[PDB]
Amino acid sequence: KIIDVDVHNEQDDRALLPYLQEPWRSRVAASGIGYAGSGYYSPIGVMKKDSIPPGGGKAGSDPDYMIKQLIEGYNLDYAVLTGVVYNISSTHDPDYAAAICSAYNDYLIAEWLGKHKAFKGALAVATQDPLLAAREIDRIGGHPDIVEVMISSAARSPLGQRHYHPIYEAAARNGLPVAIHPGAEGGGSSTAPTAAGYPTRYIEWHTCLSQMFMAHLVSMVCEGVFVKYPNLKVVLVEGGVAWLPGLMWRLDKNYKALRATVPWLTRMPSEYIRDHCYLSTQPIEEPDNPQHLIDLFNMIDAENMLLYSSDYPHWDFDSPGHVLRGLKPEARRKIFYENAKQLYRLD
Amino acid sequence: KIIDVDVHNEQDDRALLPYLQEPWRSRVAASGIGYAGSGYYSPIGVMKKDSIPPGGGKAGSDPDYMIKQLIEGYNLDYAVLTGVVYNISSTHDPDYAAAICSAYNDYLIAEWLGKHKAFKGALAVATQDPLLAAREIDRIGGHPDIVEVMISSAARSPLGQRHYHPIYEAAARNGLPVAIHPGAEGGGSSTAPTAAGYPTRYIEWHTCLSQMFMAHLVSMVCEGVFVKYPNLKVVLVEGGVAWLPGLMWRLDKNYKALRATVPWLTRMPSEYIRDHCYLSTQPIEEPDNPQHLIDLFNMIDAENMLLYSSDYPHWDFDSPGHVLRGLKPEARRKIFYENAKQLYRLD
Ligand SMILES: [Fe+3]
Ligand SMILES: [Fe+3]
Ligand SMILES: [Fe+3]
Ligand SMILES: [Fe+3]
Ligand code: NA
């Protein structure tokens, strides 16, 4: 039926205290997790309506409330819990960041993935010190309910550059796709959140996040990341879709004239993207004619690259029934179930 | 029959010396114009085949050769000379950058615009000091063959922010569209050239230029530049087309949820763009099925915002007969002549 590839479980900073190494544990006990936020005030908060659990705190913080509202509410075969901790990549201390990710991966294993069969996990790593991220991927990637690695797209340079390759080597060797998720662009020591620098308000910052993915993606393709690690899968989570055709054409046209500068590439850039990359659908783009979005998919044979997600319980939550309704049934099968069942090797 | 809204006349740095005050003249005579280039080496170079004039200098440097090879080799009724000096916005000294722009505008008027009727020009200004740019727009904007202002997309912050508004105010007051053109991104004291920072190779830098336009465009709309200045037209020159619809759909969707934060907006973001912005066609996007580009246009009704340009004499130059052969005649007339004729009020 349905696999949701982006479900944000949440937790009080103090939920990680039992899993944190010293000195980082004492830090969090005294001040919470030193997240270095983007600094763009959204007024509609982040969460949707009536997702705050009974008695609980943050929306998404109660496994039982989420089994009910999401797993059985919308009949989901599997849900990939992606948490929020990958955002710590924006902070300044590489060891603090890795230690927080390490404690979260354990917490997720101990307290979430065993509470339902549908529950699967993205392991989080910090990108400031890619060597520590490789360690964590090898430490914990073997767990049978851990199906991918989650990275923030708030980095210190384009993600295709060699400083990061230890992460791709480790994930590809383990068979774990690398998911990339926005949220922290511009915070702490990451790069400016848009090519033109820092916008003034949240609506600009949010709209522009897709452009970070385009930059990172051009870097990963042209730096030959997929030539160097032919087993790598990259999943672009929550960054839009409709921009991909134009990027594909622009990048292919430049490649035709510029191939000699990038000789490790032996097929067109668009084919590397199609063969190695996936994109989640949330927040689904809404042309006035919904048929248009589908026409866009078909223009670049992207039905095998698209993964449904709800992004429960955020304000732009996508219920599966209302998304992509004019899709052929065989394409709807692929985007709602089969692409992800294959990608994560589920069942 | 045809109007070409982006043609790069070139000149020897030394050609500005008669228009330059000291100490600027002495610097140019000794060291050329201090362009802070992208620092990305193009192996082809920025120039076309067989465009180097007889015995003359750079391709595009000779009015009579250009009149022959371009203005009449293709049956252009008007060509908008845009030069390359607007790239000087990347440099560190605002007074130097303004003087350079002022000397170029004087040179363009005296040595180019009168040498043929099809010649129309784009006054250039430096963005480091928008007050000096406003003064230059008022000095020169009234000339009968000056049809627009030209600024570089390599800025120190998103171009919709209030720091730049004196430019838009002066252009609108003189009935001049404001054109934006890539080329200097990341040079000197401008912002990093992509949202992810600095890529390693020309092919990435060039591909990602569209994203700079996307960020500036979202800035101008959301900062209410088209509400503050309701008689302002903006021309996105040489930055692609196929990304527009996904941007229009993402922005409109966020607008619906976030309109309270941006109350000066009393219409959908997509509609400010449709009513205030144009985009040149070069470099024409080349999908496998050239129909897919046109299908893309009609999804957003963009036939009224697209302006043909050849971008002579660059490597990704576009010959008129070759681009958009699939267009309906009425759409072709608009894109190749009618949009530009109305915009610049020619004839
Ligand atoms: Fe998400
Ligand atoms: Fe979200
Ligand atoms: Fe140009
Ligand atoms: Fe060019
Ligand atoms: Na920063």
Residue numbers in the entry:
A (entry chain B), B (entry chain A): 5 to 351
Excerpt from the paper describing this PDB structure:
Dinuclear monooxygenases mediate challenging C–H bond oxidation reactions throughout nature. The protein components of AibH1H2 stem from a largely uncharacterized structural superfamily, PF04909, containing over 100,000 unique proteins that can individually function as either carboxylases, hydratases, hydrolases, or monooxygenases. Each of the four candidate AROs can harbor redox-active diiron cofactors.
The genomic neighborhoods of candidate AROs stemming from Litorilinea aerophila (A0A540VG95, referred to as SfbO), Afipia carboxidovorans (B6JH23), Cytobacillus firmus (W7L2Y2), and Geobacillus strain Y412MC10 (D3EI84) intimate disparate physiological functions. Each of these proteins was fused to an N-terminal His6 tag, recombinantly expressed in Escherichia coli, and purified as soluble protein preparations. Aerobic samples of these Fe2-metalated proteins were found to exhibit moderately intense UV/vis features centered near ∼350 nm, consistent with charge transfer bands classically associated with diferric FeIII–OHx–FeIII motifs. These features were diminished upon anaerobic addition of ∼1.2 equiv of sodium dithionite (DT) and returned following reexposure of these samples to air.
